Amino acid sequence: MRLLLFRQRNFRNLALEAYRPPPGLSALVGANAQGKTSLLLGIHLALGGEVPLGLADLVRFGEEEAWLHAEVETELGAYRLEHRLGPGGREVLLNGKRVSLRTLWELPGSVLVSPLDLEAVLGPKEERRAYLDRLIARFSRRYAALLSAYEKALRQRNALLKAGGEGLSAWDRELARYGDEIVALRRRFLRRFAPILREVHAALAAKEAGLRLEETAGEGVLRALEASRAEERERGQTLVGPHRDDLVFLLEGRPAHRFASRGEAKTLALALRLAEHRLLGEHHGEPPLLLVDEWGEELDEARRRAVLAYAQALPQAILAGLEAPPGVPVCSVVRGVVLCP
Numbered sequence: 001m002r003l004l005l006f007r008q009r010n011f012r013n014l015a016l017e018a019y020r021p022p023p024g025l026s027a028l029v030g031a032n033a034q035g036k037t038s039l040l041l042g043i044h045l046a047l048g049g050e051v052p053l054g055l056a057d058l059v060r061f062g063e064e065e066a067w068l069h070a071e072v073e074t075e076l077g078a079y080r081l082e083h084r085l086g087p088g089g090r091e092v093l094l095n096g097k098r099v100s101l102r103t104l105w106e107l108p109g110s111v112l113v114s115p116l117d118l119e120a121v122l123g124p125k126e127e128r129r130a131y132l133d134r135l136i137a138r139f140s141r142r143y144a145a146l147l148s149a150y151e152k153a154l155r156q157r158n159a160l161l162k163a164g165g166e167g168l169s170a171w172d173r174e175l176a177r178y179g180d181e182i183v184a185l186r187r188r189f190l191r192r193f194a195p196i197l198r199e200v201h202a203a204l205a206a207k208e209a210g211l212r213l214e215e216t217a218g219e220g221v222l223r224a225l226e227a228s229r230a231e232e233r234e235r236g237q238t239l240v241g242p243h244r245d246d247l248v249f250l251l252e253g254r255p256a257h258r259f260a261s262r263g264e265a266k267t268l269a270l271a272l273r274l275a276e277h278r279l280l281g282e283h284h285g286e287p288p289l290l291l292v293d294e295w296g297e298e299l300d301e302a303r304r305r306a307v308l309a310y311a312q313a314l315p316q317a318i319l320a321g322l323e324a325p326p327g328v329p330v331c332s333v334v335r336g337v338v339l340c341p
Contacts, residue, residue, distance in 0.1 A: 001074055001107075001108040001109075001110075001286055001288060001315060002023055002072065002074075002315065003043065003047075003070060003071075003072055004071045004073060005018060005019070005020050005069075005070070005071040006018070006019045006021075006042070006043050006046060006068075006069065006070050006071075007019075007069040007070075008066070008067060008068050008069070009066065010065065010066045010067065011059070011060065011067070011068060012034075012038035012041070012042070012057070012059075012060065013034060013035055013038050013060070013336055014038055014039060014060075014336045015337050016336060016337045016338055019039070019331075019338045020340065021318055021331070022329055023315070023316055024315075024316060024317075024329075025311055025312045025314070025316070025317050025318075025329075026318055026319070026328060026329045026330065026331060026340075027318070027319045027321070027325065027328045027329070027330045027331070028318065028319070028320040028330070028331055028333050028338070029320075029324050029330050029331070029332055029333070031334075032333065032334070033320075033322070035333050035336060036293065036320035036333050037114075037115065037320070039320070039333060039338070040114075040291045040320055041112065041114065042068055043110065043289070043291060043318075044110050044114075044291055045058075045068055045085075046069065046070035046082075046083060047070055047072070047081060047104065047107075047110040047289065048104030048105055048107070048109045048110075049109065049110060049112060050101075050134060051114070051116065055085065055086070055087070058085050064086055065084055065085060066084070066085040066086070067083065067085075068082065068083040069083075074107050074286065075108075075284070075285060075286045076106075076107060079094060079107060080093075080095055080096070081094060081104060082094075092104065102141065102144050105137070105138050105141075105144075106141075107284075108280065108286050108289070109138075109280075109288050109289070110289040110291055111273055111274075111277040111280065111291065112273070112293065113269075113270055113273045113291065113294075114293055115293060115294060117266075117269035117270070117272070117273060118262065118265045118266045118268075118269045120269070121249055121256050121257065121260065121265040121268050121269050122257055122260070122262070122265050125246050128246070128248070128249070128257075129243075129245060129246065129247055131247070132186065132213070132247045133147060135189075135276060136185065136186065138276075138280065139189070139280070142185070143182070143185050146178050146181055146182050146185070147182070150175065150178040150182060153171060153174040153178060154243060156171060157171035157172075157174075157175055158236070158238055161232065161233070161236055161237065162236045172221075175221055175225070175238070176220065176222045176225070179217065179241045179242050180217075180220055183215065183218070183221075183245075186242065186245075187213070190213055193211075193275060193276075194210065194211050196278055197209055197210075197211065197271055197272060197275040198210065200274045200278070201267070201268065201271035203306040204267050204270060204271055204303050204306050204307070205267050205268075205271070207264065208251070208253075209250065209251055210250035210251075210253065211247065211248065211249050212248045212250065213245060213246070213247050213248075214245060214246040214247075215245050216239070216241065216244045217240045217241050217244075221240065221241050224240035224241070225238075225240060225241075228240050249268060249272075251264060256268055263298075267303070270307070274307070274310060277290055286315075287314050287315060289316055289318070290310075290311055290314055290316075290317040290318075291317070291318050291320075292307065292317065292318070292319045292320065293320050293321075294321060295319040295320055295321025295322075295325075296322035296323045297321065297322075304325075308325055
């Protein structure tokens, strides 16, 4: 994957007209860390990323819409990716054609190591499950399509529930059809991803990292629905199925959301991103672009070496921090504009 060109208008605090990163590994330097963080985030979204931000935190103050453009070369060919972010939503174009966002996940895209990442490790149940669904959807168009179909069957089913004792029967079978498949795909995915997470985290930290997906309907959605029938009737809501399952991250066998320090969480989050990156490379046959924010933060030598060692072996990667690694080509960001000397 080679990002050839990034252009933007009215995205966060950026002013650049164009940014042309070099091939290989490069670093963004400058006093304004927020500018760098926005640049990396703009690139990530240009390439098909998603992040949790109100429009006033994606679009420049006093402006209506933002635009993002990326020109990439991939194993699949050359592509022009564009996004308009405004009151109407996110409009995505690929080579001049309006496409669903998920279409861009047909290409390798990017992985961003962001300051936002630790909050999932530390945050509520629903956020870890949301992370899981976004992750797997990158890999599997069937999974993305099952999420949509399940969410319809669920919506329709809870409506029949809220409206008394209804004819739930056909809804049970639909929820199970989509749900059982989602459960299966999650198990398959996590069998591949968990060992990668453990390996990657071992290079960054002393504590063993793990994960567990706790299922409400592990013997099948139909059978769990039966067993929850009185109780779901009592609450007005489906209580079992993959929308209720919990992804737990572990350090030394113990839940990270309870027993990780913020620093430990930040390193676990880093490992999760690098494991996602590795697995995407296997899936696509070509690595995503890797974008690393906070390169310079309170890093230790071995942690740095391990990430630098990973990033410097890719076709292209961009780091942003207070200082660049020595010998890494550097581009300055000053007043929203990049200069690559």
